[PDB]
Structure formats: C-alpha cells, structure tokens
Amino acid sequence: RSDPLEGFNRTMYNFNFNVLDPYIVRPVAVAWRDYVPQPARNGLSNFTGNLEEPAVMVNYFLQGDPYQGMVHFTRFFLNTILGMGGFIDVAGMANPKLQRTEPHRFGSTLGHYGVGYGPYVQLPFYGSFTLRDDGGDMADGFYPVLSWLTWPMSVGKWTLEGIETRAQLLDSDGLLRCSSDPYIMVREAYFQRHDFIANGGELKPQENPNAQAIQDDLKDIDSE
Amino acid sequence: EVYNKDGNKLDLYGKVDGLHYFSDNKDVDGDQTYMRLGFKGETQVTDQLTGYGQWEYQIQGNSAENENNSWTRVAFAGLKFQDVGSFDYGRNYGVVYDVTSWTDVLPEFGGDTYGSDNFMQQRGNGFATYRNTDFFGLVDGLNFAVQYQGKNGNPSGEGFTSGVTNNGRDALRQNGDGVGGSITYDYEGFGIGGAISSSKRTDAQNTAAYIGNGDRAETYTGGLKYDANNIYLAAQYTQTYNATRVGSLGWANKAQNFEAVAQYQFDFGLRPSLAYLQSKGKNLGRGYDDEDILKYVDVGATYYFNKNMSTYVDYKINLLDDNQFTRDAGINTDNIVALGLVYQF
Amino acid sequence: EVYNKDGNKLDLYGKVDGLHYFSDNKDVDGDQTYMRLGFKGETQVTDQLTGYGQWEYQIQGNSAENENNSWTRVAFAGLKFQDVGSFDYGRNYGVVYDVTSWTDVLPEFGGDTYGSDNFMQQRGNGFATYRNTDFFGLVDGLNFAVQYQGKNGNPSGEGFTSGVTNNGRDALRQNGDGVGGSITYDYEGFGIGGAISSSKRTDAQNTAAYIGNGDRAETYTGGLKYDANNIYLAAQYTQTYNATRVGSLGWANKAQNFEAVAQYQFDFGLRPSLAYLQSKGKNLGRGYDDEDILKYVDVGATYYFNKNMSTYVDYKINLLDDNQFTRDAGINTDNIVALGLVYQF
Amino acid sequence: EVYNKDGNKLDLYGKVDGLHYFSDNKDVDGDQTYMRLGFKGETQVTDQLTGYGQWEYQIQGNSAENENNSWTRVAFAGLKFQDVGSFDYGRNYGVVYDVTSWTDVLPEFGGDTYGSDNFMQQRGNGFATYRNTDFFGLVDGLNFAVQYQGKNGNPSGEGFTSGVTNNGRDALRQNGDGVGGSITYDYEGFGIGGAISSSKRTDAQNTAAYIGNGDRAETYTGGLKYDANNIYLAAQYTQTYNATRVGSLGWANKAQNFEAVAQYQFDFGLRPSLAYLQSKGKNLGRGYDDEDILKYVDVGATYYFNKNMSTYVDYKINLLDDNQFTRDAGINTDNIVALGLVYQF
Amino acid sequence: AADQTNPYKLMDEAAQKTFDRLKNEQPQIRANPDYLRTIVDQELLPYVQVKYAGALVLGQYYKSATPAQREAYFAAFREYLKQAYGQALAMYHGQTYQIAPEQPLGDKTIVPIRVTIIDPNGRPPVRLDFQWRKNSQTGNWQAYDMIAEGCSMITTKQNEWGTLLRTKGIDGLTAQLKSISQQKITLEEKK
Ligand SMILES: CCCCCCCCCCCCCC(=O)O[C@H](CCCCCCCCCCC)CC(=O)O[C@@H]1[C@@H](NC(=O)C[C@@H](CCCCCCCCCCC)OC(=O)CCCCCCCCCCC)[C@H](OC[C@H]2O[C@H](OP(=O)(O)O)[C@H](NC(=O)C[C@H](O)CCCCCCCCCCC)[C@@H](OC(=O)C[C@H](O)CCCCCCCCCCC)[C@@H]2O)O[C@H](CO[C@]2(C(=O)O)C[C@@H](O[C@]3(C(=O)O)C[C@@H](O)[C@@H](O)[C@@H]([C@H](O)CO)O3)[C@@H](O)[C@@H]([C@H](O)CO)O2)[C@H]1OP(=O)(O)O
Ligand SMILES: CCCCCCCCCCCCCC(=O)O[C@H](CCCCCCCCCCC)CC(=O)O[C@@H]1[C@@H](NC(=O)C[C@@H](CCCCCCCCCCC)OC(=O)CCCCCCCCCCC)[C@H](OC[C@H]2O[C@H](OP(=O)(O)O)[C@H](NC(=O)C[C@H](O)CCCCCCCCCCC)[C@@H](OC(=O)C[C@H](O)CCCCCCCCCCC)[C@@H]2O)O[C@H](CO[C@]2(C(=O)O)C[C@@H](O[C@]3(C(=O)O)C[C@@H](O)[C@@H](O)[C@@H]([C@H](O)CO)O3)[C@@H](O)[C@@H]([C@H](O)CO)O2)[C@H]1OP(=O)(O)O
Ligand SMILES: CCCCCCCCCCCCCC(=O)O[C@H](CCCCCCCCCCC)CC(=O)O[C@@H]1[C@@H](NC(=O)C[C@@H](CCCCCCCCCCC)OC(=O)CCCCCCCCCCC)[C@H](OC[C@H]2O[C@H](OP(=O)(O)O)[C@H](NC(=O)C[C@H](O)CCCCCCCCCCC)[C@@H](OC(=O)C[C@H](O)CCCCCCCCCCC)[C@@H]2O)O[C@H](CO[C@]2(C(=O)O)C[C@@H](O[C@]3(C(=O)O)C[C@@H](O)[C@@H](O)[C@@H]([C@H](O)CO)O3)[C@@H](O)[C@@H]([C@H](O)CO)O2)[C@H]1OP(=O)(O)O
C-alpha cells in the first residue's frame, strides 16, 4: 500500500538505526544479556505485563469477547495477589492455556471495526509509530491502575520493555541489513504485526503463501 | 478415604482458610483465618439398611494463645435404608436451609439473612430429620423431609428456675418444639423448592426487653434453581415472622427476605459470582416503622487451581444508609473487601 | 487403623453419641449429644521393648455457637517390655478403676457414684501407673499394678499462697500425693479383683465451708465378674473413707457403696441390662445421718446392629426421696429415660 | 502419610508429652502435660506448581474436666511453584524465628527471651511471609525472605472508641503495620544468618506506664551455627528495641540478649546438650538503671530410642537473684528440673 | 557429483573442481560468458539441488505450485543457479580457493559447510557458508543455504519476494528465473 511523505521518513530512519543503535543501544544490550541474570530479566518482563493486564481486558469487552475478557482478569488477579505485585508468572504455570499473551491496546479495537492507517512517521528514539495503533494508545490513561503512574516512572517502563526485547533480537540482527533497503522490510514487518485477521495484534508466526510447501515434493524436483 | 475395611469407609476432609478483611469500619477488618476439621464415615450394615455419620469443628486461628474460639458446626449420625428413606439424629441443618442452599453459593458473604440455632434456619442442636430419596423410588428429583426440634431455654443453674434445660443459652438463639418440612423437585436442570416451618417461642423470648411477640412463629420460603451448561441462576423469596435477628434486641415482627444469585463456570477455573440480597423488615413495634435489615450487592470471582485448592475474591457493595436504627442494631453499612486462600484436603 | 508402616502402627478410633433426655427434673432435661475423637498409636523399637500411646477427647454438641465445652479424657505415653511390666505417665485411669470397670458396663448410665478428678476413682491427672501382665509370665490371669499421684493445689492466677500448682483446680477436685495399687485374678469365666488406694488431702479440702475433714482418704474396693456362655454377671462392694463426693457440700466421712449388674447376650444382638446402685451414708455430718447419697435402678436393652453402629434404650428409676438433704446437695431425684443410637468408627 | 491418591498427599504428625515439673516456685510446680496435634497436606496441581498447607493444635492435658486450655500454633496456606520461592499467608513463624531457631534446640526450655505473638519474632496472626530458596535457583545455600504484618489491636466488642480489631486481645500483643526480612547462608556445616525487623505499635501499647515507650520498634538479629560430624554448635546475639517483654510491668526500651548452645549426638541414642541464656535490660524506666531480665544455663540430654520415642531430663540453673524487680514482674529466680516423655507419630 | 555420506567431503571436492575449471578455462569464460554457466553446472549445481536450495531464488514466491509455476524453482532453477555461481566465479581474476577439512557433522537436518576464498589483489576474504541439509527425498549432499562472507544471503529474497506475490501472485515470478538464467555473466573489469 502506498504511503505519503516519501521524501521524509528515510534519512531519520537511517540515522536512528545506523548511529543511535550501534553506539548506545547495542553496547547496553550486550551487558544486559550477560551481566543481568535470566531470573532478574524474567521478573521485570512479568512486572510490565501486570501493569497492562487491567487495561487490555477493557479492549476485549469493547469489541466483545467474554472468553478472552475473563482470561486477562484472572492473570492480573493471580499475579498481583499471589506474585507480590506480578514479580513472577503465577498464571503462566497455573494452566497451559493461560500463558503469556501479546497485549491488545486501544488500537486493536479501532482496527477491528475498520479504520485508516494514515501516514507513517518514524518518531525519533522510538522507532515505528502509527496514528491508528501507536497514536491511539493514549486512551488507557484514564482507567485505574494505569493512571497511578507519573511521567518519569511511566517512561522508564517503555525503556525497560525495549531493552528486554532487544536481547531476543540480538541473535537475528543480521537480517536487518541483509536487504538492499532496510526501510522497506521494517515497514512491512510492523504492518504484518498489526494487520492480521480481524486485527487482534499479530497472528501466529507463519507465511500464508505456501510456506514450506515444496519440501514435501522434492524427490522429483531436485533431480533437475 | 483413609480407612476402608470390613464394609466401613471413612472419608476424612476439611478446609483451612486464611482470610483478611479490608474495611473502614475498624470492627471486622483484619485477620479472619479459620479452619474446619471433621470426618464423614459410612458403614454398610447389610445390602439394604446402611448408615453414615458426619462431624465438623471450626477453630478460629486469628485469636491469641490465651483465648480460644471454637464451635461445632454439624454433628449427627443415623441409618439410611435402601428405598424407604433415612433418619438421622444430631446437629444437622434446618428445613429452610434445604431451599436456601441454592442462593448461598457465594464464596464468603453467604447466608447473611439468618443465623445458627435461629428457628430452624441454619445448623441446630437436637435435630431429628427423616428424609426420603426419590419418593420411595418412584420419581426422580422429588425429595421431601420432615424435621423436629427439642426444647432449649434458660441456662441451667444460673439464677433461673423456669425454662431451664441442660443446654440452655441466651434468648437470642432460643426455640421451642417445632415441626418443619421441605419439598424439592428437579426434573431436568430446573429445580423448584419450598419449605414451611413453625416453631414455638419460649417464655424468655416474650419479655419486654426485646421486640417481637407471639406464641408461634411461622416461616415461609420458596425459590427456583437452574444449574445446567455450566450456568447457575437461582433466586428465592423468604417471608418469616419473628424469626430473623435484626441485630440485637430480639427479632423483627415481620421480614420479607429476597435473595438472587448468578454464577458462571469457565473451562480454565474462573467462576464469577454476582448476587443481590434484600431484607425489608416492616411492622416494627418500636416506632422504627419500615426499615431495611440487609441490602447489598456482592461481585467477585473464584479461580479453581485444582479440585483441592482454589482462590477467590469478593467485593461487598453496601448501599444501605446508617440511620439511628442501624447503629443500635449493629449492622455494617460500608463496603467490605474479602480475599483469601482455601485448601481442602 | 490408618498407619501400618514398619513399627509405626496407629489406630484412629472414635464415636458420635446422639442422645436425648426425658425427665421431670428440668435441670437435666434436653439433649446430651457429644462425640469422642482421638488417635491410638503403637510403636516397636526392639523385639522386646514396645512403645504405645493414646489420646481421647470429648466435646458436647448440645451447646450453642457462642460457647463450647471441651476436656481431655485420657492422655498418656509410655513403654512396654516383654514379661516384666510397663510404666506410663500421664492422664490415665486409676488402679481402683481397673476393678470398677466391670460394673459400669451400661452404654450411657453407670459410674455415677463418683465424679471427675475424685482421687483414684476415675480418669485423673498426673498419674504414674506401673502395670504388669501375667505376673512376669508366671501365672495366667493374675495381674497387679501400682500407681502414684502428684500434688495439685490452688491455681497460680490468683493469690492463695500455701499449696499452689500450675494445674490448679477448685476446692472440690484437688488432691495430694498418694500411692495406690490393685490386684486382679482372671479365671476361666469367673473373675475376682481387689484394689487398695490412699491419697493425701490438701489444706484446702478440709476447711470449714466443706463437710468432711481429715488427712487421709484411704479407700478399699473389691470386685467380682463372670463373662462366659454369652452372659455377664458382676458384683462389687466397696468402702470409701472421706473420698466420696456428695452433691457440692463436700465429702462423706464414711460411705458404703454397693453395685451389681447383670447383662445377657442374644443371637440377634439384643443386650438387656439391669443394675442397682446404692450410696447410703454412715457417718455424715452437719445434721445428716444415714442419708442416701444416690440410689437408683437402671433397666434397659441394647441392640447391636454391627460392630460399628449400635442402638440402646435406658430407663433409670430413682428410689431416693426428695428431702432437704437432696435439695441442699442438688442431687437428681427424678426418673430419667434416654434413648438413641451411637456410631463408632 | 495416610492418604496418597491422584497427587493429593496428607501427612498426620504430632506428639504426646507428659511433664512433671519439680521446683520450689508455686507458679510452675506441678504437672504440665501437653499434646500437639495437626496435619500437613500437599497437593500437586501441575508439574511446575504444587500446593501445600500446615495446621497444628496444642491442648494442655494437665487441666481438669471443666476447663479448656487449647490454642492454635500454626495455620497457613500457600502455593509453591517450581523454583521462584514460596509464599504463604496465615498463622506462621516470623522472619526472626527463622534465624533464632538455631539456638532453639532444647527439648522443652530455650527461646525464653521472646514470647508468643511478640511482633515478628514467633508465631502470630495475619502473617504474610515470602521465602525464596537458593536465590531463585542461582546459588546454593543463600536464602532470603520477606514478611508482612497486619494491624491487630484492641478487641472490637469491648466498648472502646479508639482503634480496635475483631481478633483483639489484651494490651500485650497488639502490633501495627510493619515489615521485616531475613537472610541466611548455608554451607558444609557452617551457617551465617541475619534478620532485620521493624514493626509499628498501636497507641494502646503505650497508653499507661508501660516502662518502655516509642513510636517504632526495631529488631536486628544474627548468629552462627555449626551442624557437622554429629556436632551441633550455635551462638546467636541480637539487639532489640521495644520488642522484648519484660513481664507484667511493660516493655524494655533496650535489651541486649545473647544465647549459645552446644550439642554432640552420640552413636548410642543419647544426645547430651548444653546451652546458656542471658538477657540484659538497659534504659529501663521507673527508676531501673541496669538489671538482668533472664539469665540461666541449661544442662540436659535426650535419648531417642529408634526415631520417635525419647526420654529427656532437664535442669536449668537460674543465676538470677530475688529482688523487687523480679517480684513485681513475676519471674522465677530458682533452679528447676523438668522430666518429660515425648512419643511422636 | 555429490556424496551421500560425507557432506563436507563433497563440498570440498566441488569447490576444488570449480576453481580448477575456472583457471584452466579462463579465456573461455571471457570469450563466452554463457560457457562458464555450463561448466559451473557440473561443479556448483551438482553440489546444491534446486529443490533443496529453493530459498535464495523464487523461495517465497513462484515455488513449484500453481500447476504452471514450475519453471522457476524446480525445472529451470538449475540454469539460474549455475549462472549466479558463474558470475561470482568470473569476478575473481585468480583468487585462491581454500578447501575446508572434513569436519564432523553427524546425523542432523542442518549440516553447516563453509569454505575460504582469498583474493590475490588484496581484497578481504569471502567465506561461502553453504549450509547443507540431510533431505529424506534426496540422499545427495545438497546445500540448502547460500551464505557469502558470513551474511545469510539464503533468506535475502525470502522477505523481499512477498511484496510482488501479494498482487501478481505466484505467476509473476515464473518468468523471472528464465530471464536470469538466460542472462550472461558480467566479468569484473580492472580499472
Ligand atoms: C507478601 C509480600 C511480603 C512483603 C514484600 C515487600 C516488603 C514490604 C511490603 C510492605 C511495605 C509497605 C511500606 C510501609 O509499610 O510503610 C512504612 C514503612 C517505611 C518503608 C519500609 C519499606 C521496606 C521495604 C522492604 C523491601 C523488601 C523487598 C511503615 C507503615 O506501615 O506506614 C503506615 C501506613 N502504611 C501501611 O501500613 C502499609 C502500606 C499501606 C497499604 C496500601 C493500601 C492497601 C493495598 C492493598 C493490599 C494488596 C493485597 C495483597 O503502605 C502504603 O502506604 C503503600 C506502600 C505500597 C506497598 C504496600 C504492600 C502491602 C501488602 C503486603 C503484601 C501482601 C498506614 O497508613 C494508613 C493506612 O490506614 C488504613 O486503615 P483504614 O482502613 O483506613 O482505617 C489502611 N491500613 C492497612 O493496614 C491495610 C490493610 O489493612 C493491610 C493490607 C495487607 C495485609 C495482608 C493482605 C494480604 C492477604 C492475602 C490473602 C491471600 C491503609 O490503606 C487504605 O487506605 C485502605 C485499604 O488499605 C485499601 C483497600 C484494599 C483493596 C485491596 C483489594 C484489591 C484486590 C485486587 C483484585 C482485582 C493506609 O495506608 O498506617 C500508619 C499511618 O499512621 C496513621 C495514619 O496517619 O493513618 C496515624 C493515625 O491517624 C490519626 C489521624 O491523624 O487521622 C491520628 C490519631 O491521633 C487519631 O486521630 C486517629 C483516629 O482516631 C482514627 O484515624 O487517626 C491512625 O489513623 C493510624 C491507624 O489508623 C490507627 O492507629 O494510622 C503508617 O505508619 P508510618 O508511616 O510509619 O508513620
Ligand atoms: C509407676 C511407679 C509407681 C510408684 C512405685 C512405688 C509405689 C509407692 C510410691 C509411693 C510411696 C512413697 C512413700 C509415701 O508416699 O509417703 C506416705 C505413704 C506411706 C505408705 C507408702 C506405701 C507404699 C506401697 C508400696 C507397694 C509396694 C508393693 C504418704 C506421703 O505422701 O508422704 C508425704 C510426703 N512424701 C511424698 O509425697 C512421696 C515422696 C516424695 C519425694 C520426692 C522424690 C523425688 C521424685 C522422684 C522422681 C522420679 C524420677 C523418674 O517421698 C518419699 O517417701 C520418697 C520415695 C519416692 C516416691 C515417689 C516416686 C514415684 C515416681 C515413680 C517414677 C518411676 C511429702 O513430703 C514432703 C514433700 O514436699 C515437696 O514439695 P516441695 O519441695 O515444697 O515442692 C516434694 N513434693 C512432691 O510432691 C514431689 C513431686 O512433686 C512428685 C514426685 C514425682 C511423681 C511423678 C514422677 C514421674 C515423672 C516421669 C515422667 C516420665 C517432696 O520432695 C522434695 O522435697 C524434693 C522436690 O520434689 C524436688 C525433687 C528432685 C527432682 C529429681 C528428679 C531428676 C532425677 C535425675 C535423673 C538423672 C517432699 O517429700 O508430703 C507430706 C508431708 O506433709 C507436709 C510436709 O511436712 O512437707 C506438711 C506441710 O508442711 C508445712 C510446713 O512445715 O512447711 C506444715 C504445716 O503445719 C504448715 O506449717 C505449712 C506451712 O505454713 C507452709 O509450708 O506447711 C505441707 O507443706 C505439705 C505440702 O507441702 C502442702 O500441703 O507437706 C507427706 O504426707 P504424710 O507424711 O503421710 O503426712
Ligand atoms: C424424624 C421424625 C419425623 C418427623 C418428626 C415427627 C413428625 C411431626 C412432629 C409431630 C407433630 C406434632 C408436634 C407439635 O409440635 O405439636 C403441635 C403441632 C400442631 C400442628 C403442626 C403440624 C403437625 C402435623 C404436620 C404434618 C406433616 C406431614 C404444637 C405443639 O408444639 O404443642 C405443644 C405441646 N406438644 C409438643 O411439643 C409435641 C409432643 C411432645 C413430645 C411427646 C412425647 C413423645 C415421645 C417421643 C418418642 C421418641 C421416639 C423414639 O407432643 C405431642 O403432640 C405428641 C406427638 C409426638 C411428637 C414427637 C416426634 C418425635 C419423632 C422422633 C422419631 C424417632 C407441648 O406440650 C407440653 C410438653 O412439655 C414437656 O416438657 P416437660 O414435661 O415440662 O419437661 C414435654 N416436652 C418435650 O419437648 C419432649 C422432649 O423434649 C422432645 C420429644 C422427643 C424429641 C426427640 C426424639 C428423638 C430422640 C433420638 C432418637 C434416636 C412434652 O412431653 C412430656 O410431657 C414428657 C415426655 O415428652 C414424655 C415422657 C417420656 C416417655 C417417652 C420415651 C419413649 C422410650 C421408647 C422405648 C422403646 C409435652 O408435650 O408444649 C406446648 C404447651 O404449652 C405449655 C403447656 O401447657 O405444657 C404451656 C405452659 O404451661 C403452663 C402450665 O399450665 O403449667 C401454662 C402457663 O400459663 C403457666 O401457668 C406456666 C406455669 O406457671 C408453670 O408450668 O406453665 C408451659 O409449661 C410450656 C412449657 O412447659 C414451658 O414453656 O408448655 C404445646 O404448644 P401449643 O399446643 O401449640 O400451644
């Protein structure tokens, strides 16, 4: 799909990914993966999810999901009470069907009914940013539990969340520069994680157009 | 469970509850932990005439070492025939509880419209119940029972010469010789019940220090239950005269209790519970005219980790004002938050 | 029996007593529902030494929810060695009760001649009893035992000085340091017994507010029993000096207690029971002379459904008068009939 | 372990102890037979989540048949994951008790510096403890824990217009909202422990002249242990502020108490013991400058027959002297000898 | 050809044969770029099957499905692979080819094989990490990946061919392989 502002959104992305990334984010990612123990990282990851659990349940109720709405309520209740503020994954090990799930912000509800994506702007020090999903996230600040966070502590959680996800992306960092134009693959990667069937975040990690379909008939294909 | 030999089987059970109350009344808040201990045996005398027994004991763990707070909940034993019914004598439930058992499935705030040893409304002493199952093996779901009560009056040997019995207590939980019965029917997922009981009042309950006068007190109830497809929907209406305890100072002359419950069962274990309770006690003979005894909305959910342990939360929304009558009676008018863990073995 | 490990045998016994009382005297009218709970374990250290221990509890279920009555019946531990004897210390039965147990065989009544903590007459506290079996393996049926009693005084909660112990009691249940013993012989069917005990009297038991003063309370008790051909015959006459409690006034100086029972066993489980007991005094004080402390005749039958649940009916006829002596001491002078069923596990 | 089915595990434990104290002091001389009874269940919900519970009761067998001296010791429930630690809420032990239990090795005596329900030092009500083992499975022997406390104060039903609680007691065990934690290090025999506690006290705690006054009470512990080659050596020294009960006079602002034990378990059952206890009171009120609250040395031995049956003799030499402070507080200042018999099952 | 038991030995032999053929027939490649593709078919195409290495070219799109989309990844992919390998071989002007030793791979579905190439003009070395896979259908040691200088170039077109397949489908890339295979190699000219 064509997008406006073709002249811009290109030099800023290169500066943010080739100057700020390998000089500040990259050195701190290696130390975080090595010096910080795995149990410490796991505890911080569950703490961030617990703070957004009473916020994603409202999104499911707006679109309509009695089964999924109660799933998040149980996770928040068990993590806060039986996990001392969500420091451990109480609900993760309680049931195999109650594992971690991707959060659904206010943008998921807007996309379920059908809304325009609008222009795409790469915000500095933030990465991908969109008006419908990322720009529509400023709606849960009036709900309880989330309104108790002030500006300094709230921005700390966002930095912590980005650092945690950087460790998993350090093993597969070679594919970012593999393509001729890294901007093209980044835009499509973010769009594929927010334009699934009936929105709802991202779908399972699979490719619809015949993924691994030729491996089952390679007996008569490899001979040529 | 722990012993099965020579036709005798013992099923030891119990539950330890660690509960805490969060409220601004400063009268019920704090630690409210308690534990239940008891057994449930069963012996097969022959191929037709069987027998069983049940005992329970509740000990409050929130007290100190110098104070003990324990009481017996149910303690009864009796035989059970194959197709003519069963008869058991001892401490068991009343006749009104057989119809009210469908609207008190709330985790913590359940059965607040009555009290123990109060005109056959809850567990009482000296209860002789004859219950027949399946109407002597004729129809399915049609169950009926008949219960009788002894005489309990003034305490023995403490400044009393009339109405004295070996198990005397205060006049707040005294009752005479009464007879009651309950009829229930469950064809397919739908339950209908109704009980009529009448118990005589002792002389100590007719004094001028407590409200409510009458030689005989009659209680009427009735409700419907629906438990199918993991959906619970029950509601009952109760109309008792000189039976419900309005705090202190005796009982109200006429009360119209109304209870309704609604619960759902999920596949992962969560069991949300929403219920509404009403109690419009009128015809008060002390100038208090029409007043509300109890009225609150409870919303909560219970999560079952397994068949032996579960976690629940509760939120009692008390929308009743605190007037002069409520303060004298001693009824809580503010919201109470209940949360705790239960371990049943 | 719930534990059968290597030298860790443990048996869990108990029963539930559902009974009701019917009498003209309202002081004992009502219900006397109670239950017994406790464990009984036995260990095996070596081929000769053997450890054992048991505990019994009794709680009355006829009380309300505001209070409860609880007391420990027996609680003792000790070791048993092969053919040399056994010594156990704790809450156990006296040596005199070993021969008196042949008389009070009624399901509910019987044993009303004495009371709790009445020196070496019933289950006391702080008893050091040494028991032997088969007289060091020499003769069959001949057994003997000795017992020592500790000193108990006033409670330490209040200032009383003199004799004060941690396990304090009232002025009608205290005891001193005494030594007792018993000798019993068991023949084929026939049986004889004899016990002699003497307990010291504290300074709080011979005051001016209680009838009966003295330093020693020596008692002599015989015994005769016959358990053969499915019949039960027992006779026992004893003389008690300054140890038999009469009402609440105090202790009789000299009393002659005689009791005899007779029971028959039927094929289908019927066990009729007849008993006669007299407690006529000899040297009573404060104006009393030749006054009967207790005199009643009990007749009833016991139906044995099985070894777990049994039913019985009791009818006690009081042959004593209602003069000022009985009214002052508060002794029951009305016939009591009690019927019910018990379930033991 | 009497029940093991579908992952459910129930364990029954307890002991019977017959104590016959011999001493010149009237407040401690006499029989002190007590019995412990309880269960310990554990349910395996999933592979990485296991539930468990614990309950215990203590009934004194030295009382009469008309008095009850039963109280609870521990009653809590919680959930245990694979390796994150452990969290349980209910009646449990404090963080200080986890470190000070090294010197609590005597059979009957020991640990007399603190008291029951004395803040976060022993068992109490409304205890929420989170304990982590092996530092989330990272190192070996390094464990730490945190705890939380409620706000139990004066009884609600006592006509008090100040802060009250439903599970109230006398003005000697109340405590406000406080936090505490402990850290312990384990090794091959050697051990390092340490706890830090700080809990608020209610206003009623320092209303009258209670000797010690203050807004907050701090408690710092610490000790070393050595359990290797059948040798048990421990020594713990702590300094608490307004946390140790002097007696019936109030609280001590400053208290420096140190204890040390020494044991050597022989091969032939006998386990001789040697412990010393000292407690120095500083900054006392009402004219007291510097005096010793508790100071004695305990010499004794324990003989376990095979695994459970044990006979022990204890004799603690009290180095304290009789004065006005001890008479008013009510603390014994004489050497006592205790004999017991513990039968575990 | 390709071995069936030792994948490392087959890769080393294929690399040596390709280097020897290019050096012995250097004038032939310059005279006719298409001639180098035929020689590379017996050196680099035999060591990596088209179906086994159907990820670098026409991986996400075209494939072997849709009835007519068969001359882009299975049938005509052999010529495209030879042309791509021939162009890289013709770029060098006498670069030394180092054959790695027969490292132990074991029984697994991922057999990583790498080689070392050092240019004679002073350029940095380029490592050809052609990862092999033990396919059940084809027992020959066929490389399932193509990595140059350590960069995973096997999936370079995997995430880039999806944009063209979203509109033109799988038939839009059917003729892409035919044009690439028919295109002659472009030898590097020294300036
Ligand atoms: C298991 C994990 C283990 C531990 C893990 C981590 C380790 C540490 C964790 C705890 C540390 C907290 C910090 C602290 O501990 O802090 C300091 C310590 C300093 C730093 C030390 C840090 C150490 C770090 C160690 C790290 C180790 C890793 C000392 C202190 O403790 O500060 C104290 C304060 N804070 C706390 O107690 C803890 C704390 C307060 C707690 C916050 C609210 C509760 C949260 C919910 C709990 C969650 C449930 C699990 O702290 C807070 O703030 C928030 C802190 C955030 C964390 C809290 C976590 C607690 C839960 C524990 C985990 C389960 C406390 O403030 C006031 C409190 O009063 C309420 O009662 P009310 O109901 O309103 O009456 C509530 N009372 C409670 O107990 C809460 C509750 O019962 C206990 C909950 C927990 C217990 C166990 C539960 C677990 C059960 C699990 C079962 C499975 C409470 O909440 C409220 O609002 C209302 C209510 O809760 C909220 C409603 C609850 C809703 C929850 C349900 C939702 C469920 C969701 C499901 C979907 C509220 O805060 O009281 C005095 C103030 O003095 C005054 C005052 O000014 O009020 C003076 C006086 O006033 C005057 C006046 O002038 O008016 C003067 C007079 O002359 C006179 O006139 C009188 C007049 O006659 C009458 O008034 O009044 C007087 O009134 C007095 C008393 O009232 C009466 O004597 O109090 C402070 O002393 P101070 O600061 O030292 O001076
Ligand atoms: C299973 C086995 C069964 C048994 C086997 C054998 C069977 C026979 C046994 C009994 C026969 C004995 C003779 C007898 O039984 O004798 C007669 C009966 C005669 C006929 C007998 C026939 C027998 C038949 C046999 C048949 C054979 C086929 C009656 C009587 O009983 O005589 C009585 C005396 N004798 C005994 O009781 C038995 C006896 C007691 C002696 C104690 C020995 C130590 C116990 C051993 C423990 C065993 C260890 C395992 O002695 C002895 O023979 C020694 C023998 C040992 C016997 C006990 C052993 C049993 C345990 C077995 C375990 C295996 C007793 O004397 C005094 C006792 O006081 C102490 O308390 P305190 O010190 O204050 O605390 C101690 N108190 C005790 O209870 C001891 C203890 O608690 C219980 C014992 C243990 C029981 C259980 C143990 C088992 C536990 C094991 C558990 C597994 C005790 O020792 C003491 O000191 C010492 C103190 O313990 C400390 C002891 C040290 C501890 C060491 C242990 C560690 C060992 C180390 C091991 C490594 C000392 O003896 O009291 C009155 C005297 O009257 C007075 C007096 O003058 O004092 C008058 C009055 O005084 C005045 C005053 O002037 O002051 C006068 C007034 O005008 C006025 O002024 C006021 C003034 O205003 C205020 O004062 O008061 C007043 O005070 C009153 C009372 O105090 C309060 O009312 O007493 C006598 O009455 P009377 O003479 O007839 O008139
Ligand atoms: C599971 C089974 C199936 C279900 C059960 C059965 C089905 C339905 C029930 C039956 C229906 C009718 C019941 C009723 O409910 O009846 C009506 C109801 C009306 C219609 C309602 C519906 C009915 C139909 C429903 C249909 C449903 C389909 C109302 C009422 O209730 O009538 C009431 C009367 N009747 C009954 O209660 C039921 C009833 C009483 C019981 C009769 C005894 C039966 C024996 C039991 C059998 C055992 C089984 C094995 O009788 C009877 O009908 C006989 C029937 C038998 C019933 C027993 C059932 C047991 C079943 C067990 C099965 C195993 C009752 O009369 C008096 C009773 O008092 C005694 O105590 P005391 O002697 O004093 O100690 C005895 N008290 C008892 O509790 C008995 C006992 O405890 C419990 C019974 C058993 C329960 C448990 C059994 C199970 C045990 C375990 C089993 C394993 C009792 O017998 C006695 O004598 C003595 C004794 O029992 C008999 C002797 C013993 C011999 C028997 C032993 C057998 C041994 C067997 C060996 C093989 C005697 O009857 O009291 C008031 C009267 O008011 C007064 C009065 O005038 O007396 C006024 C007042 O007097 C004055 C005065 O003038 O003196 C006037 C003043 O102005 C002033 O002057 C002062 C003055 O200053 C001072 O005095 O006082 C005052 O004194 C007051 C009180 O005393 C104190 O406040 O009483 C009446 O009220 P009212 O009529 O409405 O006005």
Numbering used by the authors:
A (entry chain D): 11 to 234
B (entry chain A), C (entry chain C), D (entry chain B): 23 to 367
E (entry chain F): 1 to 191
What does the paper say about this structure?
The outer membrane (OM) of Gram-negative bacteria is an asymmetric lipid bilayer with outer leaflet lipopolysaccharides and inner leaflet phospholipids (PLs). To maintain this barrier, the OmpC-Mla system removes mislocalized PLs from the OM outer leaflet, and transports them to the inner membrane (IM); in the first step, the OmpC-MlaA complex transfers PLs to the periplasmic chaperone MlaC, but mechanistic details are lacking. The OM lipoprotein MlaA interacts with trimeric porins OmpC and OmpF, where OmpC appears to play a more critical role in Mla function. Moreover, MlaA itself forms a hydrophilic channel in the OM; it comprises a ‘donut’-shaped architecture (constituted largely by five horizontal helices) and a vertical ‘ridge’ (formed by a ‘helix-turn-helix’ motif) defining the central channel.
We exploited the strong in vivo disulfide crosslinking to trap transient interactions between MlaAQ205C and MlaCV171C and effectively isolated such OmpC-MlaA-MlaC complexes from overexpressing cells, followed by purification on size-exclusion chromatography (SEC). We reconstituted these OmpC-MlaA-MlaC complexes into lipid nanodiscs assembled using the MSP2N2 membrane scaffold protein and E. coli polar lipids for single particle cryo-electron microscopy (cryo-EM) analysis. Initial 3D reconstruction without application of symmetry operators revealed three distinct classes of OmpC-MlaA-MlaC complexes, varying in the number of MlaA-MlaC pairs bound per OmpC trimer (i.e. OmpC3-(MlaA-MlaC)1-3). Consequently, combining particles from these classes yielded an improved density map of OmpC3-(MlaA-MlaC) with an overall resolution of 2.9 Å. The membrane-embedded components of OmpC3-MlaA were well-resolved with side chains clearly visualized, while the density of bound MlaC was limited to 5.0-7.0 Å owing to continuous flexibility. In our nanodisc structure, we can clearly visualize the MlaA donut positioned exactly at the membrane-water boundary of the inner leaflet of the bilayer, with the C-terminal part of the protein protruding into periplasmic space and connected to MlaC at two contact points. Unbiased rigid body fitting of the MlaC model alone in the density positioned V171C adjacent to Q205C (on MlaA), exactly consistent with the engineered disulfide bond forming one of the contact points. In addition, we were able to trace and fit a poly-alanine model of the C-terminal tail helix of MlaA into residual density not occupied by MlaC, accounting for the second contact point. In the final real-space refined model, the manner by which the C-terminal helix of MlaA interacts with MlaC agrees with the AlphaFold2 prediction and strongly validates our biochemical observations, solidifying the idea that this interaction is critical for MlaC recruitment.
